[PDB]
Enzyme design. Sequence first.
Site, PDB file in Angstrom:
ATOM      1  N   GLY A   1      40.472  38.016  39.825  1.00 42.94           N
ATOM      2  CA  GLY A   1      39.886  38.998  38.939  1.00 42.94           C
ATOM      3  C   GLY A   1      38.951  38.388  37.922  1.00 42.94           C
ATOM      4  O   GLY A   1      38.049  39.059  37.453  1.00 42.94           O
TER       5      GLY A   1
ATOM      6  N   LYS B   1      35.577  37.361  40.427  1.00 44.96           N
ATOM      7  CA  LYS B   1      35.720  38.277  41.553  1.00 44.96           C
ATOM      8  C   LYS B   1      34.787  37.907  42.713  1.00 44.96           C
ATOM      9  O   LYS B   1      35.133  38.131  43.875  1.00 44.96           O
ATOM     10  CB  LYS B   1      35.442  39.721  41.098  1.00 44.96           C
ATOM     11  CG  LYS B   1      36.679  40.465  40.543  1.00 44.96           C
ATOM     12  CD  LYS B   1      36.350  41.852  40.010  1.00 44.96           C
ATOM     13  CE  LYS B   1      37.623  42.596  39.465  1.00 44.96           C
ATOM     14  NZ  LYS B   1      38.526  43.149  40.546  1.00 44.96           N
TER      15      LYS B   1
ATOM     16  N   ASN C   1      41.168  35.906  47.573  1.00 50.47           N
ATOM     17  CA  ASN C   1      41.965  37.125  47.526  1.00 50.47           C
ATOM     18  C   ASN C   1      41.151  38.272  48.163  1.00 50.47           C
ATOM     19  O   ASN C   1      40.009  38.514  47.766  1.00 50.47           O
ATOM     20  CB  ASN C   1      42.317  37.412  46.065  1.00 50.47           C
ATOM     21  CG  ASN C   1      43.235  38.622  45.884  1.00 50.47           C
ATOM     22  OD1 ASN C   1      42.980  39.714  46.404  1.00 50.47           O
ATOM     23  ND2 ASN C   1      44.322  38.412  45.131  1.00 50.47           N
TER      24      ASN C   1
ATOM     25  N   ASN D   1      46.256  41.288  49.038  1.00 52.30           N
ATOM     26  CA  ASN D   1      46.588  41.922  47.788  1.00 52.30           C
ATOM     27  C   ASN D   1      46.916  43.343  48.150  1.00 52.30           C
ATOM     28  O   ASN D   1      46.017  44.161  48.356  1.00 52.30           O
ATOM     29  CB  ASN D   1      45.415  41.806  46.816  1.00 52.30           C
ATOM     30  CG  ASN D   1      45.655  42.578  45.555  1.00 52.30           C
ATOM     31  OD1 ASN D   1      46.744  42.888  45.282  1.00 52.30           O
ATOM     32  ND2 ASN D   1      44.612  42.902  44.827  1.00 52.30           N
TER      33      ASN D   1
ATOM     34  N   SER E   1      47.020  46.109  44.000  1.00 54.72           N
ATOM     35  CA  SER E   1      46.177  46.614  42.910  1.00 54.72           C
ATOM     36  C   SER E   1      46.702  47.951  42.386  1.00 54.72           C
ATOM     37  O   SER E   1      47.033  48.837  43.184  1.00 54.72           O
ATOM     38  CB  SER E   1      44.735  46.818  43.355  1.00 54.72           C
ATOM     39  OG  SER E   1      44.050  47.568  42.366  1.00 54.72           O
ATOM     40  N   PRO E   2      46.756  48.150  41.045  1.00 56.01           N
ATOM     41  CA  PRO E   2      47.103  49.487  40.541  1.00 56.01           C
ATOM     42  C   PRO E   2      45.992  50.517  40.843  1.00 56.01           C
ATOM     43  O   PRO E   2      46.287  51.700  40.667  1.00 56.01           O
ATOM     44  CB  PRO E   2      47.267  49.262  39.028  1.00 56.01           C
ATOM     45  CG  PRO E   2      46.345  48.121  38.699  1.00 56.01           C
ATOM     46  CD  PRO E   2      46.371  47.224  39.953  1.00 56.01           C
TER      47      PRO E   2
ATOM     48  N   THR F   1      53.207  38.158  39.780  1.00 58.52           N
ATOM     49  CA  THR F   1      52.859  39.515  40.198  1.00 58.52           C
ATOM     50  C   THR F   1      51.430  39.915  39.813  1.00 58.52           C
ATOM     51  O   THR F   1      50.805  39.249  39.030  1.00 58.52           O
ATOM     52  CB  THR F   1      53.748  40.617  39.495  1.00 58.52           C
ATOM     53  OG1 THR F   1      53.475  40.593  38.102  1.00 58.52           O
ATOM     54  CG2 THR F   1      55.274  40.334  39.713  1.00 58.52           C
TER      55      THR F   1
ATOM     56  N   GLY G   1      49.083  40.454  30.374  1.00 54.23           N
ATOM     57  CA  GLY G   1      49.373  39.786  29.124  1.00 54.23           C
ATOM     58  C   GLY G   1      50.848  39.810  28.730  1.00 54.23           C
ATOM     59  O   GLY G   1      51.741  39.969  29.569  1.00 54.23           O
TER      60      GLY G   1
ATOM     61  N   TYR H   1      45.317  34.719  33.478  1.00 53.31           N
ATOM     62  CA  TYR H   1      44.003  35.285  33.216  1.00 53.31           C
ATOM     63  C   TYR H   1      43.963  35.802  31.766  1.00 53.31           C
ATOM     64  O   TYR H   1      43.172  35.320  30.975  1.00 53.31           O
ATOM     65  CB  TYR H   1      43.731  36.357  34.261  1.00 53.31           C
ATOM     66  CG  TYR H   1      42.416  37.082  34.220  1.00 53.31           C
ATOM     67  CD1 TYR H   1      41.530  36.945  33.148  1.00 53.31           C
ATOM     68  CD2 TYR H   1      42.100  37.984  35.239  1.00 53.31           C
ATOM     69  CE1 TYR H   1      40.320  37.699  33.118  1.00 53.31           C
ATOM     70  CE2 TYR H   1      40.912  38.715  35.244  1.00 53.31           C
ATOM     71  CZ  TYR H   1      40.038  38.568  34.168  1.00 53.31           C
ATOM     72  OH  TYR H   1      38.864  39.265  34.151  1.00 53.31           O
TER      73      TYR H   1
END
EC number: 1.3.5.2
Length: 352
Positions: free
Chosen positions: A63, A66, A147, A178, A181-182, A239, A262, A312
């Site tokens: 991310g 990317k 990814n 992956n 992803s939400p 995760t 975070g 990240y």
Amino acid sequence: TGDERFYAEHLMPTLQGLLDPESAHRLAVRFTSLGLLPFQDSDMLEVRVLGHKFRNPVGIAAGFDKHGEAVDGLYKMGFGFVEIGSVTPKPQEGNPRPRVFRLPEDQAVINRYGFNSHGLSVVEHRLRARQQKQAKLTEDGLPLGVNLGKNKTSVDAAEDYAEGVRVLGPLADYLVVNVSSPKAELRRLLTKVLQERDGLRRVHRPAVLVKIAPDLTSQDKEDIASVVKELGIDGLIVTNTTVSRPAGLQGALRSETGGLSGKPLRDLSTQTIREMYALTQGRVPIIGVGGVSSGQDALEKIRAGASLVQLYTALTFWGPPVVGKVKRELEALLKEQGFGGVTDAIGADHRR
Ligand SMILES: Cc1cc2nc3c(=O)[nH]c(=O)nc-3n(C[C@H](O)[C@H](O)[C@H](O)COP(=O)(O)O)c2cc1C
Ligand SMILES: O=C(Nc1c(F)c(F)c(-c2ccccc2)c(F)c1F)c1nsnc1O
Ligand SMILES: O=C(O)c1cc(=O)[nH]c(=O)[nH]1
Ligand SMILES: [Cl-]
Ligand SMILES: [Cl-]
Ligand SMILES: [Cl-]
Ligand SMILES: [Cl-]
Ligand SMILES: [Cl-]
């Protein structure tokens, strides 16, 4: 160090006062790609896993880069390995802006980029331009992960991932599917990914890992563990961001749609690592990720079962010096707890 405090106390809060998070991120990628950047890795930090040597166990999570634009600058920042992506088969723009939000009072971020991606072809040519330079980096202990995502409008998700395996697999030390992803859908999907991977020439044949959410039911986790062992998947990344909103978030933007990262994610992630390590009997390497900002955060995930960690969101708050900080603190804690190196600490909590 003085750099760590100057970034953390003065430069980063000032930049964040002037620039919305996406603009700040684009600036960061640009500066990093140019090597415009502000610790010596010791034998204690070296890890051998996934068929590779890792000079230190701290990687940059998917991310941040990317599209594969800043890989060499990320190694210069001191990351032991770099993961680019997620990359989708066709280019796509992702969601409308604003689509990322800081939660400063929580040391957290919420994002809903929606897989903005230059697409496989562009990234392929970008990595080809430095392919031999990467070969030497990997041989020197600085591997590269890629990814893989899927396009928003795709009707056949497994074929999207298969396309990514074929196009970027030859350029990667490891690939990430992956799916976060939400059971039988995951088995079908991974069987096809592994077949495509196995069809690459040996010198161009990467490890395959599955990246999971922190939001799974117990049943989901047990099913994933079973399929991963049965198919011979090489590793787990544990995760992605969470769609939960833990009690206690203070940020004004806490109810924005998206994945939370975070500090509020940290221990949810660590517990998911712990559970997946137990469910796979310690036999499936885990890359641990979510709220890592200090050496203590990193070692907690290592003791829970992670062979490597990534971060990240900590970079977004504390800036480039956070990488050397995490590594220095990790080395000091390993000695304090009597480990000869990272490798001896992997999964140590399960042996208490
Ligand atoms: C702005 C942003 C974009 C992300 N995009 C991706 C992505 O394209 N693919 C992926 O597998 N994870 C992506 N993630 C998740 C991170 O790789 C990581 O799993 C998550 O943020 C937890 O780590 P952290 O708390 O150190 O940020 C993204 C995270 C952020 C904050
Ligand atoms: O990337 C971000 N910040 C950010 C930044 F603004 C930088 F200038 C550097 C940065 C500073 C010096 C050299 C290279 C990058 C950085 F690493 C960052 F993460 C960011 N994402 S969401 N909110 C943010 O502030
Ligand atoms: O929106 C994205 O692109 C994205 C966000 C995130 O948190 N995780 C992911 O895998 N993709
Ligand atoms: Cl899109
Ligand atoms: Cl914001
Ligand atoms: Cl193809
Ligand atoms: Cl090739
Ligand atoms: Cl949401």
